[PDB]
mmCIF file of all heavy atoms in Angstrom:
data_model
loop_
_atom_site.group_PDB
_atom_site.id
_atom_site.type_symbol
_atom_site.label_atom_id
_atom_site.label_comp_id
_atom_site.label_asym_id
_atom_site.label_seq_id
_atom_site.Cartn_x
_atom_site.Cartn_y
_atom_site.Cartn_z
ATOM 1 N N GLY A 89 14.740 -37.972 -22.424
ATOM 2 C CA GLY A 89 15.194 -36.630 -22.742
ATOM 3 C C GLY A 89 16.707 -36.542 -22.802
ATOM 4 O O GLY A 89 17.259 -35.945 -23.723
ATOM 5 N N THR A 90 17.370 -37.152 -21.820
ATOM 6 C CA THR A 90 18.823 -37.148 -21.724
ATOM 7 C C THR A 90 19.479 -37.852 -22.923
ATOM 8 O O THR A 90 20.394 -37.305 -23.541
ATOM 9 C CB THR A 90 19.283 -37.793 -20.398
ATOM 10 O OG1 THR A 90 18.789 -37.018 -19.296
ATOM 11 C CG2 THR A 90 20.794 -37.861 -20.320
ATOM 12 N N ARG A 91 19.000 -39.054 -23.247
ATOM 13 C CA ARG A 91 19.452 -39.792 -24.427
ATOM 14 C C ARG A 91 19.282 -38.978 -25.700
ATOM 15 O O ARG A 91 20.195 -38.883 -26.519
ATOM 16 C CB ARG A 91 18.645 -41.075 -24.628
ATOM 17 C CG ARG A 91 18.700 -42.102 -23.538
ATOM 18 C CD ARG A 91 18.102 -43.419 -24.044
ATOM 19 N NE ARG A 91 17.610 -43.294 -25.415
ATOM 20 C CZ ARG A 91 16.323 -43.229 -25.748
ATOM 21 N NH1 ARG A 91 15.385 -43.298 -24.808
ATOM 22 N NH2 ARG A 91 15.972 -43.105 -27.023
ATOM 23 N N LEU A 92 18.095 -38.413 -25.879
ATOM 24 C CA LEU A 92 17.787 -37.671 -27.100
ATOM 25 C C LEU A 92 18.527 -36.337 -27.221
ATOM 26 O O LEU A 92 18.886 -35.939 -28.330
ATOM 27 C CB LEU A 92 16.274 -37.475 -27.257
ATOM 28 C CG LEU A 92 15.519 -38.762 -27.593
ATOM 29 C CD1 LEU A 92 14.020 -38.532 -27.623
ATOM 30 C CD2 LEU A 92 16.005 -39.302 -28.924
ATOM 31 N N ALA A 93 18.762 -35.650 -26.102
ATOM 32 C CA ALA A 93 19.561 -34.420 -26.152
ATOM 33 C C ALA A 93 20.976 -34.695 -26.683
ATOM 34 O O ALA A 93 21.482 -33.936 -27.512
ATOM 35 C CB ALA A 93 19.606 -33.726 -24.794
ATOM 36 N N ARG A 94 21.601 -35.780 -26.224
ATOM 37 C CA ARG A 94 22.908 -36.187 -26.765
ATOM 38 C C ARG A 94 22.838 -36.423 -28.275
ATOM 39 O O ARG A 94 23.664 -35.904 -29.034
ATOM 40 C CB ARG A 94 23.432 -37.473 -26.097
ATOM 41 C CG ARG A 94 23.712 -37.394 -24.613
ATOM 42 C CD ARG A 94 24.402 -38.683 -24.145
ATOM 43 N NE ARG A 94 25.545 -38.983 -25.003
ATOM 44 C CZ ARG A 94 26.807 -38.679 -24.710
ATOM 45 N NH1 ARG A 94 27.109 -38.088 -23.561
ATOM 46 N NH2 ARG A 94 27.774 -38.979 -25.566
ATOM 47 N N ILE A 95 21.872 -37.237 -28.700
ATOM 48 C CA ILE A 95 21.671 -37.532 -30.116
ATOM 49 C C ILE A 95 21.452 -36.258 -30.937
ATOM 50 O O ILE A 95 22.065 -36.065 -31.995
ATOM 51 C CB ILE A 95 20.441 -38.442 -30.336
ATOM 52 C CG1 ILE A 95 20.646 -39.818 -29.700
ATOM 53 C CG2 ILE A 95 20.145 -38.591 -31.813
ATOM 54 C CD1 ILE A 95 21.649 -40.666 -30.406
ATOM 55 N N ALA A 96 20.568 -35.394 -30.445
ATOM 56 C CA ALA A 96 20.200 -34.180 -31.166
ATOM 57 C C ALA A 96 21.394 -33.227 -31.265
ATOM 58 O O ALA A 96 21.625 -32.601 -32.304
ATOM 59 C CB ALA A 96 19.007 -33.497 -30.494
ATOM 60 N N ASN A 97 22.158 -33.128 -30.185
ATOM 61 C CA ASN A 97 23.369 -32.317 -30.200
ATOM 62 C C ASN A 97 24.448 -32.828 -31.155
ATOM 63 O O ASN A 97 25.124 -32.038 -31.811
ATOM 64 C CB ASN A 97 23.913 -32.137 -28.785
ATOM 65 C CG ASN A 97 22.972 -31.324 -27.913
ATOM 66 O OD1 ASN A 97 22.142 -30.572 -28.421
ATOM 67 N ND2 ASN A 97 23.100 -31.470 -26.593
ATOM 68 N N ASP A 98 24.620 -34.145 -31.236
ATOM 69 C CA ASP A 98 25.605 -34.696 -32.165
ATOM 70 C C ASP A 98 25.160 -34.427 -33.605
ATOM 71 O O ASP A 98 25.969 -34.093 -34.460
ATOM 72 C CB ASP A 98 25.809 -36.200 -31.934
ATOM 73 C CG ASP A 98 26.550 -36.495 -30.642
ATOM 74 O OD1 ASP A 98 27.297 -35.613 -30.164
ATOM 75 O OD2 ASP A 98 26.378 -37.602 -30.091
ATOM 76 N N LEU A 99 23.862 -34.560 -33.861
ATOM 77 C CA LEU A 99 23.325 -34.339 -35.198
ATOM 78 C C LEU A 99 23.412 -32.855 -35.549
ATOM 79 O O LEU A 99 23.650 -32.494 -36.690
ATOM 80 C CB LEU A 99 21.877 -34.822 -35.280
ATOM 81 C CG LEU A 99 21.738 -36.344 -35.319
ATOM 82 C CD1 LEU A 99 20.282 -36.737 -35.244
ATOM 83 C CD2 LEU A 99 22.359 -36.864 -36.598
ATOM 84 N N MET A 100 23.215 -32.004 -34.548
ATOM 85 C CA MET A 100 23.374 -30.565 -34.731
ATOM 86 C C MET A 100 24.819 -30.215 -35.123
ATOM 87 O O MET A 100 25.060 -29.442 -36.053
ATOM 88 C CB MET A 100 22.970 -29.807 -33.466
ATOM 89 C CG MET A 100 23.189 -28.285 -33.571
ATOM 90 S SD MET A 100 22.042 -27.484 -34.728
ATOM 91 C CE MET A 100 20.563 -27.424 -33.705
#
Side-chain angles (χ1 to χ4, degrees):
Chain A
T90 297
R91 299 193 358 254
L92 289 175
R94 297 188 51 98
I95 296 289
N97 294 338
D98 289 336
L99 286 174
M100 177 70 78

